[PDB]
Design an enzyme around this catalytic site. Sequence first.
Site, short mmCIF file in Angstrom:
data_model
loop_
_atom_site.label_atom_id
_atom_site.label_comp_id
_atom_site.label_asym_id
_atom_site.label_seq_id
_atom_site.Cartn_x
_atom_site.Cartn_y
_atom_site.Cartn_z
N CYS A 33 93.80 -39.20 20.51
CA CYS A 33 94.92 -38.92 21.41
C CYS A 33 95.29 -40.15 22.26
CB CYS A 33 94.62 -37.71 22.28
SG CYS A 33 94.88 -36.14 21.42
N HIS A 83 96.67 -32.48 18.51
CA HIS A 83 95.25 -32.39 18.69
C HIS A 83 94.78 -31.00 18.25
CE1 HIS A 83 91.29 -33.40 20.59
NE2 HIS A 83 91.23 -32.09 20.67
N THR A 93 82.04 -36.66 14.70
CA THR A 93 81.75 -37.20 16.03
C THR A 93 82.97 -37.32 16.94
OG1 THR A 93 81.91 -39.55 15.34
CG2 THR A 93 79.71 -38.52 15.21
N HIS A 139 88.88 -34.41 16.75
CA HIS A 139 90.32 -34.34 16.52
C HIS A 139 90.42 -34.57 15.02
CE1 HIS A 139 94.70 -35.74 17.58
NE2 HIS A 139 94.62 -35.57 16.27
N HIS A 188 90.77 -35.31 11.30
CA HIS A 188 91.23 -36.48 10.54
C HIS A 188 90.64 -36.50 9.15
CE1 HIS A 188 87.54 -37.50 12.62
NE2 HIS A 188 87.36 -38.55 11.84
N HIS A 241 89.27 -39.31 6.29
CA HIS A 241 88.90 -40.66 5.96
C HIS A 241 89.41 -40.96 4.57
CE1 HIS A 241 85.68 -40.85 9.07
NE2 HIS A 241 85.70 -39.54 8.86
ZN ZN Z 1 92.97 -35.73 20.15
#
Ligand code: ZN
Lengths: 115, 115
Positions: free
Chosen positions: B8, B47, B96, B99, B101, B103
């Site tokens: 964020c 988020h 870890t 938010h 995501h 890879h």
């Molecule tokens: Zn975030």
Amino acid sequence: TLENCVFCKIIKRELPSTIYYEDERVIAIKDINPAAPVHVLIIPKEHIANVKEINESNAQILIDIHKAANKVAEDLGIAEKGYRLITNCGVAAGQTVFHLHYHLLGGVDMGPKIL
Amino acid sequence: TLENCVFCKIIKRELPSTIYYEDERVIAIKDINPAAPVHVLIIPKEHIANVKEINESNAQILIDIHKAANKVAEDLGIAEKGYRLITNCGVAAGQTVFHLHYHLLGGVDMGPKIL
Ligand SMILES: [Zn+2]
Ligand SMILES: [Zn+2]
């Protein structure tokens, strides 16, 4: 469908499977050489090689894929501790069956290194 | 946005980044501790903790995510040899930063074992 594709065969009932979720768009099956205590393959019924072939015309299948990953993760008791999703494109990435799928992995602490 | 979330912050320009793709819905940045020669994080601007929070109301973001993964894979020269996509849910899965995501990993032969 592709004649020579193991997953396509599984879908058409030419080979056996352990099926944790199914509808007209997607199927989720047990991986018979598990890499974790829970190892499910989430497979779109439409034969597409890998996510490089996903585009504006077919991309909605990603939703079904992630929906079923979540439902199965709940059904198999790994959702609360968590889980990893993996999809691979090409032999350099380790893909050996060229029909798009995600691996849903869980039931063991997998820790920091993702590769 | 969450005040205390590194990604964020990156999005709002409170921290630096190397940004390979961006629009109003998604951003793709370099991972500063790469696990492969090409290691990009594909991050929705909204988020959301991880894919366990994806549902009927927000799931279209998966499309943007996979779209940008493909475009960046092309831009960075790993698309043709291939690549791996990974997302994790929970600390047992190695997450870890909470938010959502993926890879995007490439540029090295990663081979058979996915875990
Ligand atoms: Zn975030
Ligand atoms: Zn197939």
